Write an enzyme that holds these catalytic residues in place. Structure first.
Site: not given
Ligand SMILES: [Mg+2]
Length: 324
Positions: A60, A81, A167
């Site tokens: 995800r 990650k 971001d």
């Protein structure tokens, strides 16, 4: 200098250490199993911490880059990650390691294995703010204000430490089991602002932005950037939360960067039914000129007042489907 002698010591091995070591090592990567782990519950064995050997995976992210993991010795479960080595930026860890804020997902360690950088962090059980918006079209104003408020507290933390997220968006905000807490993540686009306040520029190749729709005008214009870019993004996030879709998306199809540059701010996408102070907060957060745009801290205040203006937070965590 002394950091050079130091990193050479750290290399070639997975150890249990502090954040500074991880950071220093990280710079090495941004220029075969090695790394640093910052919590007792993730434990190397004999200088190594290898996937499928010492920890196993259970995707995800924007790239399906993030997985639930489990340490095979300790039983502890967190998130990994995966980031490719040739693309890796130390700022992912620099803007993250040892940052003691509840509004920033804690980092548990980072371990290089071959061409992979495996970044370990807390698994927040409630998923991303992005997924929440998808599931329920859009969010109620008070709920929307609540999460923006918490993202701003996290950005105020980063900015005061000379750090820009790069971001900011719903997908990069994570939620606790009850949806009570929100915390920033994905620092892949983070930049470290050098001594002279504002820095870099997209065209030099230092600030590479993350999400086009959330991108401030000074970015597109190839101008020098500061923390203020985050404030613009956070309001694009706000619009996303309120409308159930990104700015520009419903109106323009093609190269948005050119539109963001020369159009008025997405201010027209503000719902007419919003509390005047909510509209004002977004309006100030979406000033095309950075210098006049409010800071995260300044926006935090306006947001905080707007939440009170709407009778506080009284919307359920998960219930209504609110059509986009
Ligand atoms: Mg992400």
């Amino acid at each position: 200098s002394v950091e050079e002698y130091l990193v050479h010591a750290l290399q070639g091995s997975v150890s249990s250490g502090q954040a500074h070591s991880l950071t220093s090592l990280a710079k090495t990567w941004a220029a075969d199993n090695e790394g640093v782990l910052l919590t007792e519950k993730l434990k190397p064995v004999d200088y190594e911490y290898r996937e499928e050997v010492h920890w196993a995976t259970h995707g995800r992210g924007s790239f399906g880059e993030v997985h639930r993991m489990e340490d095979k010795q300790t039983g502890f479960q967190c998130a990994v990650k995966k980031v490719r080595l040739e693309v890796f930026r130390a700022e992912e860890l620099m803007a993250c390691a040892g940052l003691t804020s509840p509004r920033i997902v804690p980092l548990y360690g980072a371990v290089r294995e071959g061409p992979w950088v495996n970044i370990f962090m807390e698994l927040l059980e409630g998923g991303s703010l992005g997924q929440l918006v998808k599931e329920q079209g859009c969010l109620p104003e008070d709920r929307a204000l609540y999460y923006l408020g918490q993202a701003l507290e996290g950005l105020e933390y980063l900015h005061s430490r000379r750090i820009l997220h790069g971001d900011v968006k719903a997908d990069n905000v994570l939620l606790s089991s009850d949806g009570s807490h929100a915390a920033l993540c994905d620092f892949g686009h983070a930049v470290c602002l050098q001594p002279d306040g504002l820095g870099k520029s997209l065209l030099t190749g230092d600030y590479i932005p993350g999400t086009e729709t959330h991108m401030a005008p000074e970015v597109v214009l190839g101008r020098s950037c500061d923390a203020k870019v985050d404030v613009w993004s956070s309001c694009c996030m706000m619009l996303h939360m309120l409308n159930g879709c990104h700015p520009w998306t419903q109106f323009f199809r093609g190269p948005l960067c050119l539109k963001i540059a020369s159009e008025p701010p997405p201010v027209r996408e503000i719902p007419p039914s919003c509390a005047p102070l909510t509209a004002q907060a977004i309006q100030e957060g979406l000033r095309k000129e950075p210098i006049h745009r409010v800071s995260a801290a300044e926006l935090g205040g306006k947001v905080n007042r707007a939440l009170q203006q709407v009778g506080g937070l009284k919307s359920p965590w998960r219930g209504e489907y609110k059509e986009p």
